[model samples]
Target: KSNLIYDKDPGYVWDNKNECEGAAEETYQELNYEPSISADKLTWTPTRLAKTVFNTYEDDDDFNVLCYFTDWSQYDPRIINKEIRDTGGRSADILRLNTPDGRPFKRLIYSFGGLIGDKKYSADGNASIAVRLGVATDPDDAIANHKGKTIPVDPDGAVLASINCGFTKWEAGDANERYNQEKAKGLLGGFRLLHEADKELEFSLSIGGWSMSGLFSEIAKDEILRTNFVEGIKDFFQRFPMFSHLDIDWEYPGSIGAGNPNSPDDGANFAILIQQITDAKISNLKGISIASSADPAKIDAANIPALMDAGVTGINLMTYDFFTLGDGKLSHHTNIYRDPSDVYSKYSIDDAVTHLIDEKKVDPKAIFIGYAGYTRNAKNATITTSIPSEEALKGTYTDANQTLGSFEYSVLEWTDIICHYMDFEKGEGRNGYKLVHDKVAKADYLYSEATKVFISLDTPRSVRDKGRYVKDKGLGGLFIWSGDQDNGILTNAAHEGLKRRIKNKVIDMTPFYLD
Candidate 1:
C-alpha cells in the first residue's frame, strides 16, 4: 500500500479515511528550512572525467537517477531547499538525496537553450567560446559568482554522476559559427564551483524542448543543413573542452506544442539527425533524447527503431502532463495507475512505459522514466473522492491574480500548493482548505468546500509509488522534470522508493557515448 500523507515522521502518513472525518490531528513538524550540509563539507575534489555511469540497465548495479536544475531556479528563493538556503547561496543543494541503497543522485541536467536566437559567449585565442546559455540574468548570475566559494553537497556524501547543461535550439541558419562559438561557454560559467571542487561531473548540452521544436523540423529535413549541424556540433565541443554529451529534447515528432510548427518527417528526420550526430564520433560524446509520452500510435513508428539502432544511448520519456490547464473536473495529472473511470486516464505513466517496451520494443535498459515536480489545478470542480473529468469541472477557479486560463490557474509548483497551501502544519486549515489522498488513484489533492477549488498533484507518496513501478519494470532509470519543487521531498521519495541494496560496487563515471 502507498503512503499518501507527507508527514516525514510516521515513516509516511496514509491519511485517507474510509470517509471524510474532518481535519486530522496535526502531528508533523513544520517543514524545516535550514541547510543540512555544513559549510566545510561543500568542496569537491575531482579526480576523473565527469560523466554518467549507467549505459545499460543490465549493469548489475544500482539504477540511474537524474534531476533537472533549471536555469531560472535561483530567482525563486522558495525553489531552493533549506540546505542551500542556510548557506545563502542561489544553487539548490542538488546532491541532497540518498538512494535506498545509500547512493547519491546520478545526474543533473540544466535546462534550455533555444534554436539559435541570441548567442552569449567569450573568446580565447581566436576560438569563440560559449558559457552558460543565458536564461534570466539574476538566477544564473548568482551561481556563476560562486566560483571558489563555499558550496553544498548531498547528505549521503555523493557527488552528481554527471551535470548536463542544455537546451541549444537550431535557428534558421544553424551550425553557424556564432552558435558553435557561444555554445561552449554555456555550462562552464555556472558550474565553476563544481568543477573546482574536483568532482567528476559530466557536462552536456540539451537542444529542442517543448516550445523549441520548430527549428528541429527544419534542420532534420535538409541534408545540407543536417550536415552543417554535425560540423558545428564538433566545433561546439572543440570550443568547450568540458562538454561530454548532448541531450536532444524535441518534444515529439508531428505533435504540436506551444503552437510550434511540425513536420510529418519530424519523426523520421529526428532519427536521421541522431544517426548523423553519432556518426560524427566526437571523443566520448553521448546523445540522449527527451521523448514524448503521447500514445505510441501518435508518433511515427519507424523513428523508434531508427533511434534505438542509431547509436542513441538513452530515451528520457516525459511521463507527466497527462492533464493540462483548463482541464475539466478533477484528476491526477501524473498518476501511476491507469484509471478506467476517467476520460484521460489511459494516459498514465504506466501506459507510456508499457507502449514503449511492449509495443515499440525498445531496449528497456536504454529508457529513463520522467516525473514532474509540479502540480495542475483543476479549476471549478466539485470536491469529492469520486473521480471527475475535464468536461465535468464546475465552479470558477482562477489564480491569485484572478487570471483564468492555463498560465494563471492551471499550473503550479508543488512547494506552493503542497508545502504552503495543503500542509497540515502550515496550511489554510483554519479556513476550509483540506489535503486529501485518493489511495486508489495513488495521488494527492487539495480541496475546499467553502471556496470550491480543487488542485491535483503528485505527492511524495505518489512519487514513491511511481518509483517502485520503475524498479518493478527493471527500466534503465528515473529522471525528474526539475529539482526546484517540493523542497527536495519529491526527489527524496524517488530516491527512497528506488533504493536497492547493493554493496562493494564501484560506480563508474564514463559518458557511454553512442557506439
Candidate 2:
C-alpha cells in the first residue's frame, strides 16, 4: 500500500533565526511542492547485469512456483560469477535488495533510445522479454526455480506467460489485437484488464533500463548519466500490458536545464515534456520515482513549482551522488556544501535532505536516496598518482574568441592549460581539447562567435554535498549519475562537500543564498 510522508526541519535549539531560515515540519501540499508521477517517463532502473536469473510467482502453502529466464548477452566476469554462478549465485550489483544476504526484488522495466521504430535505434529488432510475477515465500525454494520450469500452466490454473514476437518488448504494437492479445497471454493479464478501471486494489510495478535499454553493461562499467536513457520507460509501457503501479527511472528532478534568456524561449520545452506524461490516460500510472541527477538549485528556482501546479503527486529525487561525490573539504566528513578546500571533498547525506525540504518541499518517504556499494576515485593534483601530468605540469586555456583570462591547472585555481603553460611551447591543440579546457573557467560561462565554456563538470564532493543538502531539506530522496564519468568519483575540493550533505544532513543554505 502506498502512504504519504511529510518533511521536517532541524531544531534550532540555539534559536538562531537568520534572514530567511527557521525550523519546522512541513508537508509537500503545505509547501505547495507536489511530485509528478509523469514526466517524460523515459526512466532507468539500477540493476546489476547477469544471465539466467529467474523471475518468479509462487503460492507457498500450495508449494506452487513459477519463474522465467533472463539472458545476460555478454560474458562479464563481474556478472557471470556474481549473479549467474551455479549453486546460489552471487548478488546483482546495481539493483536494490541484491546483497550477499539473500533478498529478492524482481519485476523490471526499461526504455528504448527512441520510439520502437525510431531512426537512431529500433526497439523492434532489439526487443527482449521482461516478466513480472508475484514472489514466493521460501527463499531457497524460490532460488531453486531460478530458471522458468517450476510452476506449469494447468487447465484451470493461474499460471501464465507472454512471448509475442516482432513487437517492442514492453510496448506491443497496435491498440487492440497486439496489446490485448499479448497481455491476455498471462492469467494475471486478464485480472489486470478486468480490474484496471475498478481501481479497488493497489499494485506496484517495477521498471528498469538494464540490458533492455541497450546500455551495454560492458561499456557502462559505472557511469550513470551516459547510459543512453532517452526513451526507456515510455517504450516499456507501450509494449507491455499490465496495470500495476509503474516505477520510473533515469530522468531526474534537476535534470532539466534552467531556461536561460540567451535561448529567449525558457522552460517551454520542459513544461511541454512534463505535461505530456501527466495528461496520458494511464489510470494505474499512480506515482513515479525518478533516478534524479543532482541539480536542485536550478530546478527549485524554475521548474519544481510549475510541475506541482501541473499535477505531480510526489518525487523521489535521486540522492545517491553523496556516496559517489565524497565529503566536502571543509566538512567534518559530514556536511554538504562544505568549504571547497578540504583534503577530500566529502558529501553529507543529511544536508541534501534539508535542501530538498526547505527549498523544494518534496515528501521525505517518497524520496529514495541511492548509494553505491563501491567507491570511485578522487583527483588531487598534489597526489601524483591521480593527477596526470608530465614535465612538472604543462597546460593552458587560451582562445581568441573571448577576452576571458588565460588559465591552467595544478598551479592555477582551475585546470585551464593556457594559464598553466607557455602557449607557443605547444601548438594549437587538436580537436579543441585546449579550447574545451579553457571553456570551464567558471561554474557558468559564456559562448559566442569565439568562446564557449559549455562543459562544467562537478566533483563527487560537490555532488555528495548536494545529496546531504537534499536530506536536510526534507525533500524527496536522491539518485546518482550514470555509469559514465563516475558522477562524483574524483576531484579533491569540489566533489567531497556534495557527498557529505546527504550523509550528514548538514543545513547551511548560506553559500547557495549568498552573493
Candidate 3:
C-alpha cells in the first residue's frame, strides 16, 4: 500500500496523488441526497433586510463588475488575436461582451503568484521562492522581475493554469505551445485599451490561489517574514504598473489543498498579514483585499474585524465550488439562495452574507460575492436527486488534458453544455436532457432520467440574480472566477443585471477610440 503522507518541501513534488483523489472521491461517497420538500413544508422566510452602504470600491458611479485575467490565457494567443481583430482591432474586446449598450468589465484581476521557495529562507537566503518563472535573488530582484513572465509551479509539480491545455513549451508554429511573451503582451494590450478607455478602469494582481497557497500559512505567521513578503510582492508589481491594486487569494487560512501545509492560526495571522501589507502603503496602488471560500463560521472565528480595522478594502467571497467532483453529492454548487431540501446545506450566498452582516458585523459594502463562469456535473444521478444530494453520486465529467494538483471537477462552460448535452439550440436534444431552473435555489440544472446524469450550472440568469442581490444588499460588486471562460455570456449577464440596479451613464468610447 502507498503511504498517504508525503514531504511538502520546496522543489519536492508531493506524492499524495492517490490520497487526494480518494479524499475527493470519499467526500462525495459520504453524501446523502435530500430532495426538496413541498413549498408548504419549508419554514424559512427572508428576515435579512438590504441596508445600503459604501463597499470597498466606493468610487463607483454605478456597480463594479470585476473580472479575473488568468495567466493561462497567455497560452491561447490565437483566440486573443482573433478577439482583438474581431472588435475592430481593440484588445479589450475579448473581455467586453456585445451588450446593446456595449458594457465592459470595470476591473481585471490578474492571477496568480505561486509559492516560490521555503518559508523563511530561499536557496539565496531570502524569502522562500518556488514559482515556475524567474527567481528573485533579493528584494530588489523581486521588484525588478516580472511576476507572470514565467510558468507557475508548486513543489508537487507544475501547476498548469489552463484546464483544456496543460503547460507546454512555447513554439511559434506549434498551435498548442504557449507563446509566453505574446500572452503577456496581449494581456498588457488589453490593459492599455481599458486604461485608455477609462482612466478609472482598474487592474490588479492576485497572488496565491488554491494550487499555489502552500507558503501562505508560514509567511503570514511571522512578522518579519510577512513584512518581507508584502514588500517583495509590492515591488513585484513594479513590473506591471498598470495594475493599481493587489489581491491576496489564499484559498483558506488553515485548509489543505494541493499538498499545502496548514495552520490553525492561519486565519488570525492572515488578518495581521493583511494589516501589515495595508500599512506598507504600496505606491500608486489602492487598498488590499482577500478572497475567502471558507465557511462563514470559520471566517467569523478568523480576525475579520481586525482585517477591517487594518485598512483592508474588500472580501471577495468565493461563493462557488460549494459542490464538485468527488464530493459524493450532487447540487447547485453556486446557488444564490438556500434550497429547502439540502440536508447538509449550511452555506449559500445568502447565508454567507447574512452571517457576515448579522453575526460577524462586517461592513455590507466591503463584501463582493463571487460567481463561477463554469459548472460541475454528476453521473448515475436519479430523477429524485435534487440540490444537495445525500447519496454518493459519481461525476460524469472528466478532462483528459487536465493536470493534477489543480481544482478537481469535470468543469465545463455553460454554453457547451447547453449546445451538446441539452441540445436546446439545435433541437436535437441528444441526451434528452432539459435545463430546468430551481425556483427556490435561483439556479439552473440539467436532468435526464434516460441517461441518469444531472449537471448543475450557473448561467447569465442566475448571475443576474446575484447582481440584483449585490444591489439590494448594498454589497460591494461582482467578481468572476475568471474573465476568459463562459464565452463572455455570464459576464454580460452580470453587467446587464447590475446595470438595472445602478443605471449609470455608460462611458462614451469615442474619445478613447479614434481613427
Query: Which candidate ranks first by TM-score, i.e. highest?
Result: 3
Per-residue lDDT over 1-515 for candidate 2, one digit per residue giving the tens place of the 0 to 100 score:
10100122221111132211111112212333211211111111112111112111111121101011121110122221122112111112222112122111212221212111111122322222111122223334333322111111120112132211111124342222323324433333433432343333233333223212222211122222112221233433444445344433324223232221212122233334334555555553655433333344534543455444545444444433232222311111122333332233333344444565567665565454433212221222121113222111111222212212211111111112111111211332212223111111111111111122211223233434443444454433333322211111221111232222122211222232112
**What is the number of backbone collisions in each predicted candidate, taken in the order shown?**
27, 120, 20
Q: Which prediction has more favorable TM-score, 1 or 2?
A: 1
Top-lDDT candidate index: 3
| lDDT agreement with native, every candidate | 0.47, 0.26, 0.52
Model 1's alpha-carbon lDDT is 0.47
Alpha-carbon TM-score of each model against the true structure? 0.64, 0.35, 0.66
Model 3 ranges off by over 4 Å: 1-62, 74-103, 118-186, 257-259, 344-346, 385-409, 422-431, 499-515
Clash count, candidate 3 = 20
Cα deviation in Å at residue 304, candidate 2? 2.0
TM-score of 3: 0.66
| Backbone clashes (count) for model 2 | 120
Candidate 3's residue-wise lDDT over 1-515, tens digit each? Answer: 10111112011012222112122112212322111211111111000010111112123444677877665543312122112111110011233322232235667776665544433223422222322233545544543342222223321112222211222233233211221323332344445455655666777767777666667777777776676677656655554566677788877676664566677777778878777776767776776888766366557555567667667788888888776555455567787886534643335898888878887788888898888866655555554434423432223333222211112334544333432344322322334566666666777676656545565677656887898898889888888886655444455457555654333333221121111
Q: Mind sharing the TM-score for model 2? A: 0.35
